Amino acid sequence: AAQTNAPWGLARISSTSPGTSTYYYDESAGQGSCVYVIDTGIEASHPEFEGRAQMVKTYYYSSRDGNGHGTHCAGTVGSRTYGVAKKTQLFGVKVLDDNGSGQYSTIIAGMDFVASDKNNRNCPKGVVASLSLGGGYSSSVNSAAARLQSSGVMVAVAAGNNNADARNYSPASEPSVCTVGASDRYDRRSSFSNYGSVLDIFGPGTSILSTWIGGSTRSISGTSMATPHVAGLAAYLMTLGKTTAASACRYIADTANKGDLSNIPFGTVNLLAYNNYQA
Ligand SMILES: [Ca+2]
């Protein structure tokens, strides 16, 4: 399938080179997979989600996304225009309040929720979790991310936006999950992207157009935006049968565009998520 004039990030993910605007993907499109977006929530009623999004959990007085951040991330995972996996099921878990903040304790509970909750969902092709959040190193946060992953969920997390080594951030520093740095449309490491040995992959993160609350759209930037590209890619690849929750991060690293990014610090992977789709 070919989507013309796609957001640059979608195009980049199906391309061997920067500077193209069409997104290419197998039409299975992540059908029969599920992605949990653990964030400020999802505006499920947005036309771009077509009935495939649902709020499953909140730790606050409402499950609505009163911020827009979670809705943007979800749109990058699986909205029809702005999404990588255009046919996936999207499940929202609101661990972040409408200011985009959340106590580590609520975030942990949300991770443990998904690990159980996937048993109440229909996801024959596999389960993915997108965590576009983080804070200072916490062994308890990392451990919760490691449980989610061990339970059979492909866990993708933001490296963080401090232009710093991500070893000092959680869940970014957890070895067993997929830690995602941010790149721009000229294949530069995004100026704010964290780096370091704990990174597994880069995805598009600068000037990323996606869904917003109030049924609209906007372009915003962060390893928050890169993460759902990789989460959506894993879902897509899982439905294609190419990989599984336990091996998807490795598989993505293995099949990535390699050596193409600029301003990658010595010791950080130079790998850009790529779907290797042959139209
Ligand atoms: Ca990692």
Report whether 200 belongs to an annotated binding site: yes
Report whether 16 belongs to an annotated binding site: yes
In the chain the domains, ranked by start, together with CATH numbers, are 1-279 (3.40.50.200)
**CA dist., res. 67 & res. 45, Å (int):** 15
Please give the positions annotated as active site: 39, 69, 224
Q: Which residues pair with 181 in a beta bridge?
A: 202
Query: CB-based burial of residue 189 (10 Å sphere; 0-12 exposed, 13-18 middle, 19+ buried)?
Result: buried
Q: What is the whole-number distance in angstroms between the Cα of residue 178 and the centre of ligand 1?
A: 5
User: By the 8 A CB rule, do 234 and 275 touch?
Assistant: no
Q: What is the whole-number distance in angstroms between the Cα of residue 176 and the centre of ligand 1?
A: 6
Long-range contact set of residues 240-249: C-beta below 8 Å, sequence gap at least 24: 240/26, 240/28, 241/125, 244/126, 245/126, 245/127, 245/128, 245/149, 245/152, 245/153, 245/154, 246/149, 246/152, 246/154, 248/126, 248/128, 248/154, 248/178, 249/154, 249/156, 249/177, 249/178, 249/200, 249/201
Question: How far are the Cα atoms of 78, 167, 221 from residue 19, in angstroms, in the given order?
Answer: 23, 32, 18
Token pair for 75: 């749109």
3-class DSSP state of 237: helix
Q: What is the whole-number distance in angstroms between the Cα of residue 132 and the centre of ligand 1?
A: 14
- CB count in 10 Å sphere of residue 124: 10
The dihedral of CA 264, 268, 271, 273: what is its sign? negative
How many Å separate Cα 174 from the centre of its chain? 16
**CA dist., res. 213 & res. 141, Å (int):** 28
Residue 35, phi then psi, degrees to nearest 5: -125, 120
Q: What is the whole-number distance in angstroms between the Cα of residue 273 and the centre of ligand 1?
A: 15
Q: What is the whole-number distance in angstroms between the Cα of residue 264 and the centre of ligand 1?
A: 17
Q: What is the whole-number distance in angstroms between the Cα of residue 217 and the centre of ligand 1?
A: 30
Method: X-ray
* 271-272 and 126-131 beta bridge pairing: unpaired
Q: DSSP letters of 112-161? A: HHHHHHGGGS--TTEEEEEE---EE--HHHHHHHHHHHHTT-EEEEE--S
Residue 257: enclosing H or E segment and its boundaries?
strand 257-258
3-class DSSP state of 12: helix
- Tell me 165's DSSP state: B
Report whether 98 belongs to an annotated binding site: no
Q: What is the whole-number distance in angstroms between the Cα of residue 188 and the centre of ligand 1?
A: 21
User: By the 8 A CB rule, do 194 and 166 touch?
Assistant: yes
Q: What is the whole-number distance in angstroms between the Cα of residue 28 and the centre of ligand 1?
A: 28
Residue 20, phi then psi, degrees to nearest 5: -115, 160
User: By the 8 A CB rule, do 251 and 174 touch?
Assistant: no
